[PDB]
């Protein structure tokens, strides 16, 4: 590939800064752009740059271009959950009629909420009566919760939830089964902390 990105992926807490790297062998050079592609959605143009302009700014994003060393950097300031996405470095090249674009493999960025006061708990949601659900919530970000097929029991991946009026953010995960199933069964001691609210 003629467009290279670094790192492959990284995970940061909200409010912190990160820098993404891009290196290219594309010749002759024309221009450099950074795309932000949210999961499942289409790419969004952030910044475009040429050899003449070594810097560009869009919001909390700031891009840099060194044409000599053929390298570019994207700097995110005060990261937000919405920043989680793939970041694509796109390099443009001069042409006989018009243009060519070289897309590099994106850098995966994941932003986690910074949870000041964890209040981890496991609740049982009233059965619809129309399988029953268990809710593991308020745990901090470091907690690893993934999907599980044992046996007719299911567990989902943790997900961040933002209540904007209360400036509140929380992580949650859900588990359910048709069967014997109880909430203390769905989430066992691994992984839940030693202090976890059960009723």
């Amino acid at each position: 590939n003629q467009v290279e990105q670094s790192p492959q992926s990284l995970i940061i807490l909200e409010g912190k800064n990160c820098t993404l790297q891009c290196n290219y062998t594309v010749s002759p050079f024309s221009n450099l752009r950074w795309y932000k592609q949210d999961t499942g959605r289409g790419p969004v143009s952030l910044t475009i740059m040429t050899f003449s302009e070594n810097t560009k700014s869009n919001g909390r994003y700031t891009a840099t271009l060194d044409a000599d060393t053929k390298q570019s950097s994207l700097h995110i300031t005060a990261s937000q959950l919405s920043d989680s996405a793939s970041y694509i470095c796109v390099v443009s090249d001069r042409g006989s009629t018009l243009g060519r674009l070289y897309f590099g493999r994106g850098t995966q960025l994941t932003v986690w909420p910074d949870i000041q006061n964890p209040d981890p708990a496991v609740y049982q949601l009233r059965d619809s009566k129309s399988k029953s659900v268990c809710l593991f919530t308020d745990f901090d970000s470091q907690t690893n919760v993934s999907q599980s097929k044992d046996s007719d029991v299911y567990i989902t991946d943790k997900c961040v939830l933002d209540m904007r009026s209360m400036d509140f953010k929380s992580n949650s995960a859900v588990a359910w089964s048709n069967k014997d199933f109880a909430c203390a069964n769905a989430f066992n001691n691994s992984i839940i902390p030693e202090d976890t609210f059960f009723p």
Binding site: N31, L125, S128, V133, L135
Partner: protein, 240 residues
């Protein structure tokens, strides 16, 4: 803006497909991209202008007749085509400009449609334990037994869609992951203040939009045809 339809399409082998791309921005240059999962974007077709017709990647054809419209066509469909298809345009710049993208189309070509199933949606009301403890109420929605993966889940409170306090699984779960074609399950959470939930005049509705077959499609099975459709579940706030 820039528009694309359909968002999700599932279709059988041999059938003809047409994908819509439209822009009111009056851009002369337009692009089509094919993107596989964890794949880079691939230029498939592009057009300089209003008669201009092959990209860097090599069966589909594109038609540019009127400026605003740049549809893409697959004459005969094959599983090989399964992928996401993005359309883009370009603004004014030194004679590529700024590139704008549509929402894209997730295209799934199956040889047999017998496996397609509609989802079942269920809402689960907040626990009393959570309310008194956190002074907050979380509702959970489950959509299950659906295939293919084409789904859009949304929450509607008192008639209006709400994005705040909502979390949805990025990826759906396979119910039987050992199996290649397997119906799915997807959950979502809506969290609101306790008093809010404790108001009985408050209505909560979890909606899943399923993209299935069409009336045009053939169905020989016993169960009702799994056509595109909306499946809902609702709860009314509970006074304690």
């Amino acid at each position: 803006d820039i528009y694309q339809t359909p968002r999700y399409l599932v279709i059988g082998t041999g059938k003809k497909i047409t994908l819509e791309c439209s822009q009111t921005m009056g851009h002369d240059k337009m692009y089509w991209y094919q993107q596989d999962p964890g794949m880079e974007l691939h230029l498939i077709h592009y057009s300089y202008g209003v008669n201009s017709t092959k990209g860097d990647l090599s069966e589909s054809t594109v038609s540019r007749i009127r400026t605003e419209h740049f549809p893409l066509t697959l004459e005969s469909a094959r599983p090989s085509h399964t992928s996401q298809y993005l359309c883009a345009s370009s603004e004014e710049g030194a004679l590529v400009g700024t590139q704008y993208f549509g929402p894209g189309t997730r295209l799934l070509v199956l040889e047999d449609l017998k496996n397609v199933f509609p989802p079942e949606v269920a809402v689960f009301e907040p626990s009393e334990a959570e309310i008194s403890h956190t002074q907050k109420a979380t509702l959970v929605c489950l959509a299950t037994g659906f295939y293919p993966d084409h789904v859009e889940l949304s929450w509607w409170v008192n008639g209006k869609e709400v994005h705040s306090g909502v979390c949805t699984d990025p990826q759906p779960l396979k119910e039987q992951p050992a199996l290649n074609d397997s119906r799915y399950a997807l959950s979502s959470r809506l969290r609101v203040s306790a008093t809010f939930w404790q108001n009985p005049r408050n209505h909560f509705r979890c909606q899943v939009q399923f993209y299935g077959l069409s009336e045009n499609d053939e169905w020989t099975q016993d169960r009702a045809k799994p056509v595109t459709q909306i499946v809902s579940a609702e709860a009314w706030g509970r006074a304690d």
